[PDB]
């Protein structure tokens, strides 16, 4: 029984060594069937080294310890066959058929533990980079649009001029180019939030919201930029059409104000004419002007229809600003009151022209009645002088027959005295009216005056000469 | 002596009647030789009626009274010839020869009294109308130019914009047309003062001055209007050339600010590449950008040379106004400090690109040394397994000759254990560097792991199988 005790200390070796690796195989099987991922990537990096130490340090001894127990069994069962001893049966379930099933399930548990950790850290690696690139991109574009909505809402242009509105439009033009450059920024952030949605980020709850808030603001900026452009282009086209009317207003306001201011001097301009044609020519030129009054009144209405159009523009489009012309110093009141003064002066000029026409007619009436008498008295005296000249020489030697004719001529002259007095009145009236230019007659009052003064001097002369010749002859 | 007393009462009649008309002829001769004109026209109008009453009322009796005394003489001297009485000789100088000389000088005094009064009132009439037309014209044009000189002096445009200066120029354009319409007004007043100078107005002393003052102001207005136009056209052409530079500034400021603001994101943009070509392609595109830095720096200098030109314009022409751009929100400081930030980020991007290139090179260095061992250990184990497979079947029936080869293969495997441990280190290092993509080899650590684990399991198996076959054969 010396060899009988050797087998007892070798069969308990297989029983103790089987429990040594079965207690290890039963403690690592729940760990190998874990497959529950961790949140951080660093945790899975350690979990791969935990599997690595198992694969290069704890599995190599157990691989050898699997067939080592099989080595001891395929020798111990040959020892109890040579000296034909009772065969060994292991306790509870520490048998060869049983241990093979534990390693068959352990090698079935790790049929993808390395491949699970690798493609979990492969996914985790992309999630960790995309998470920080999202925070980077969504903050640089978050901060860009701080205040962008409120500035787009500004209604400053409601009281701006065509200069400030065009300048505003060029500033707004530049912001549109600035906006365009960020389309690819929000396009990128939308795709980063989609890749972080597909890869299942732990905080994709707040990324779906933080990205939709940014993408929703972008929709607001697109429309707001076109709505402010719609208001700036409308304000630009309202002040542009107001300037077209303010330039066209000033264009015809000055020529008309110069014509009106000029016509006021000419309507009052004093004059003095001594010819009936001299006054007529003034009426000829004044009645020519009287004809260009509906012609210029039509122009006056047209010029006012242009400043009434600018008040209509501000009213219809409700863009309450100063309807004053910054080009012309000619007001609508000036064109109303100045015109009334010009129309008021026309009957004054007509009245003063016709009163001078009446004067020239009265002056010519006096010239005509003076010439009728002068061209009858003048030649009557020249013929009465020639009658006396012929009657004062030779004839019948009888003085008494020439004394009859001399006292007859004397009576002819007495009867004509009244007709001379007529001319003195009409002469006084011509010079009282301030006329001295008589074209119808050649004789002046003085030429008749001397003819009559000669006529009476030479009748009494030749009468006294015949009276002395009658006495100095007895 | 009854007829002797009749001649005494008839000779004293001629002596008394001669003194009656000689006292009249001597009182009217100084009046007839007056010819001293009066100031007013109304005074000469009366002076003509004074001559008229003399010509139609006081000369007609004296004409008859001249020859009436001659009638009495040429009868009285025939009476003292019939009854031969002493001839009559008039006292002092009341003789026939003497009275003829008084009337010869009286008719010589009035040889132009009517013609002097007529052409004095003819001249006076024009002087009286021209005097009131001068006062009318010189007051309407005096009042027109009240303040015209001071307004022309206004230096308001020194702080006006291109809008206000063009508008000012259109207002000034209108005043030039207003000025032109009054050239014929001052031309007329100059001719009225010349006609009042030729006709000798009593107050032509003050008309020569009052007209030269008005004509002197006109000379001032002509030059002043062209001097203010010279200043308005200069201000218009200075602000016009400043706007050409402010539009050209904004034109290239936004594209450059968008490029600069865009390049700042791309210089910091994070990335992760796992290929040596993946990193190379980034350096390819970054070094392309590094080449368009003198290209855009030249553009940056050109854009700044345009805002330095507007400061040069205000300085050279001394028209101190705001040199700020009302078109672009891009300041010169923005273009200086933003550029410095872009140049500061280039070595950061170069540093971070090259550090990742070093990583990719180190990762490929590890891939290459792992594949060199795997593509040598893998095929060595597959050839050691095939050697044992051939050595474990048939051969010499002697087990001891196969037991020699089995324990020889065993030594070959022991000597190779270190070479396997090498791969475990380099495998750990590849996954420690986060690499899993090895293209050079087909085998992973696990494929070598199972080959070695099979190799030791099947050496001890076939060794124990030969050991049982040596014992169960005696």
């Amino acid at each position: 029984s010396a060899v009988n005790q050797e087998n007892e200390r070798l069969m308990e070796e297989y029983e103790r060594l089987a429990s040594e690796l079965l207690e290890w195989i039963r403690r690592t099987i729940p760990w190998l069937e874990n497959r529950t991922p961790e949140k951080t990537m660093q945790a899975m990096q350690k979990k791969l080294e935990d599997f690595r130490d198992y694969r290069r340090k704890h599995k190599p001894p157990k691989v050898q310890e699997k067939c080592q127990l099989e080595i001891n069994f395929n020798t111990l069962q040959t020892k109890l066959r040579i000296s034909n001893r009772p065969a060994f049966m292991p306790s509870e379930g520490k048998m060869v058929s049983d241990i093979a099933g534990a390693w068959q399930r352990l090698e079935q548990a790790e049929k993808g533990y390395e491949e699970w950790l690798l493609n979990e850290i492969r996914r985790l690696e992309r999630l960790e980079h995309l998470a920080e690139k999202f925070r980077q991109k969504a903050s640089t574009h978050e901060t860009w649009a701080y205040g962008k909505e409120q500035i787009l809402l500004q209604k400053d242009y409601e009281s701006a001029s065509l200069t400030e509105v065009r300048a505003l439009l060029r500033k707004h033009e530049a912001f549109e180019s600035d906006l365009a450059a960020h389309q690819d920024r929000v396009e990128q952030i939308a795709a980063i939030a989609q890749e972080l949605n597909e890869l299942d980020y732990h905080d994709a709850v707040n990324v779906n919201d933080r990205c939709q808030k940014i993408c929703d603001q972008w929709d607001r900026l697109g429309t707001l930029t076109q709505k402010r452009r719609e208001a700036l282009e409308r304000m630009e086209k309202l002040l542009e059409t107001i300037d077209q009317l303010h330039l066209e207003f000033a264009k015809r306001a000055a020529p008309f104000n110069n014509w009106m201011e000029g016509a006021m001097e000419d309507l009052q301009d004093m004059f003095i004419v001594h010819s009936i044609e001299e006054i007529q020519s003034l009426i000829t030129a004044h009645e020519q002007f009287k004809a260009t009054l509906p012609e210029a009144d039509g122009e006056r209405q047209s010029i006012m229809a242009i400043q009434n159009e600018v008040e209509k523009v501000i009213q219809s489009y409700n863009i309450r600003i100063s309807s004053s012309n910054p080009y012309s110093t000619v007001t609508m009141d000036e064109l109303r009151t100045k015109w009334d003064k010009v129309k008021q002066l026309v009957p004054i000029r007509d009245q003063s022209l016709q009163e001078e026409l009446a004067r020239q007619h009265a002056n010519e009436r006096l010239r005509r009645q003076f010439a009728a008498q002068a061209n009858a008295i003048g030649p009557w005296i020249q013929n009465k002088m020639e009658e006396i000249a012929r009657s004062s020489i030779q004839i019948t030697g009888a003085l008494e027959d020439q004394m009859n004719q001399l006292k007859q001529y004397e009576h002819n002259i007495i009867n004509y005295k009244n007709n001379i007095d007529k001319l003195e009145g009409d002469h006084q009236l011509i010079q009282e009216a301030l006329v001295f230019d008589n074209k119808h007659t050649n004789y002046t009052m003085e030429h008749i005056r001397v003819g009559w003064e000669l006529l009476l001097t030479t009748i009494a002369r030749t009468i006294n000469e015949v009276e002395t010749q009658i006495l100095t002859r007895d | 002596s009854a007829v002797n007393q009749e001649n005494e009462r008839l000779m004293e009649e001629y002596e008394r009647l001669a003194s009656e008309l000689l006292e009249w002829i001597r009182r009217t001769i100084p009046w007839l030789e007056n010819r001293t004109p009066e100031k007013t026209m109304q005074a000469m109008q009366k002076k003509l009626e004074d001559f008229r009453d003399y010509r139609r009322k006081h000369k007609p009796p004296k004409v008859q009274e001249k020859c009436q005394l001659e009638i009495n003489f040429n009868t009285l001297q025939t009476k003292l010839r019939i009854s031969n009485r002493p001839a009559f000789m008039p006292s002092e100088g009341k003789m026939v020869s003497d009275i003829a000389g008084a009337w010869q000088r009286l008719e010589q005094a009035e040889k132009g009294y009517e013609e002097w009064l007529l052409n004095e009132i003819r001249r006076l009439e024009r002087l009286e109308h021209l005097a009131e037309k001068f006062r009318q014209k010189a007051s309407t044009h005096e009042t027109w130019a009240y303040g015209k000189e001071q307004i022309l002096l206004q230096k308001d445009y020194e702080s006006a914009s291109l809008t206000e200066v063009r508008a000012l120029l259109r207002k000034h354009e209108a005043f030039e047309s207003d000025l032109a319409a009054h050239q014929d007004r001052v031309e007329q007043i100059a001719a009225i003062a010349q006609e009042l100078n030729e006709l000798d107005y009593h107050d032509a002393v003050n008309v020569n001055d009052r007209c030269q003052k008005i004509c002197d102001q006109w000379d001032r207005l002509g030059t002043l209007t062209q001097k203010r136009r010279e200043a308005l056209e200069r201000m218009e052409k200075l602000l016009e050339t400043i706007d050409q530079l402010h539009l050209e500034f904004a034109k290239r400021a936004a594209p450059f600010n968008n490029w600069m603001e865009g390049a700042m994101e791309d210089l910091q943009d994070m990335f992760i590449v796992h290929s040596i070509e993946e990193i190379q392609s980034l350096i390819t595109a970054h070094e392309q950008f590094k080449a368009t830095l003198p290209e855009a720096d030249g553009e940056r200098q050109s854009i700044m040379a345009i805002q330095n030109e507007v400061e040069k314009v205000i300085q050279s022409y001394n028209i101190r106004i705001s040199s700020s751009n009302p078109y672009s929100t891009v300041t010169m400081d923005e273009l200086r400090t933003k550029w410095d930030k872009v140049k500061q980020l280039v070595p950061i991007r170069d540093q971070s690109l090259q550090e990742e290139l070093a990583r990719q090179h180190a990762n490929e260095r590890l891939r290459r040394q792992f594949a060199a061992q795997a593509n040598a250990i893998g095929p060595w184990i597959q050839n050691k397994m095939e050697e044992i497979a051939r050595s474990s079947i048939q051969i010499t029936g002697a087990l001891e000759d196969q037991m020699n080869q089995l324990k020889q293969y065993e030594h070959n495997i022991i000597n190779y254990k270190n070479n396997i441990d090498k791969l475990e280190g380099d495998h750990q290092l590849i996954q420690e560097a986060l690499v899993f993509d090895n293209k050079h080899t087909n085998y992973t650590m696990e494929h070598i792991r199972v080959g070695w684990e099979l190799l030791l399991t099947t050496i001890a198996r076939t060794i124990n199988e030969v050991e049982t076959q040596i014992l169960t054969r005696d």
Binding site: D266 | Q188, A191
Partner: peptide
Amino acid sequence: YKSFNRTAMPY
């Protein structure tokens, strides 16, 4: 004698 008398300019 010269004429200084003016007439309004028709439009």
